[PDB]
Design a protein around this ligand. Sequence first.
Ligand SMILES: CCCCCCCCCCCCCCC(=O)O[C@H](COC(=O)CCCCCCCCCCCC)COP(=O)(O)O
Ligand SMILES: CCCCCCCCCCCCCCC(=O)O[C@H](COC(=O)CCCCCCCCCCCC)COP(=O)(O)O
Lengths: 62, 50
Amino acid sequence: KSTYRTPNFDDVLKENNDADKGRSYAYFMVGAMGLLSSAGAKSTVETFISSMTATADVLAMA
Amino acid sequence: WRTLVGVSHTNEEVRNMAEEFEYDDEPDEQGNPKKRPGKLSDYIPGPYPN
Ligand SMILES: CCCCCCCCCCCCCCC(=O)O[C@H](COC(=O)CCCCCCCCCCCC)COP(=O)(O)O
Ligand SMILES: CCCCCCCCCCCCCCC(=O)O[C@H](COC(=O)CCCCCCCCCCCC)COP(=O)(O)O
């Protein structure tokens, strides 16, 4: 048939598009992921770095 | 000895327990060996020499 006729997309479309609400919920979930990934990567580096400080038997002879 | 403090005994309880055993010390000014009572840095001693 004619290429100007668009097929049926109605079982996935929102009843009201409302562009301020759809961009706001998607950016909440991406922002929460970057929040938790930065706090997780920070404690990971500090676990490896603090293993080079003085051990428990060295501190006992201080 | 130091690992028992704050887990099962207080700090002055472990000091009295370790002071009932004697350990090797550095030799004197002539070079003869000495002994000394134990401290919290020492390890718990065993009953046999070898
Ligand atoms: C080597 C094979 C890949 C293995 C996966 C390795 C994952 C590390 C890459 C990070 C993926 C996200 C890239 C971010 C980016 O530049 O997109 C940016 C967009 O960034 C943003 O707008 C928000 C930040 C996204 C936060 C995502 C959190 C993921 C944190 C990683 C979790 C620990 C690994 C550009 O992408 P865009 O063109 O689609 O906009
Ligand atoms: C290179 C090491 C990667 C480890 C893979 C994950 C396996 C889980 C073991 C994690 C052990 C180290 C953390 C232990 C710990 O106490 O942390 C805990 C929990 O937090 C985490 O580390 C979980 C996040 C795991 C990483 C998430 C992705 C971050 C992006 C990549 C990081 C590379 C720069 C924090 O507790 P703490 O701050 O008192 O030490």
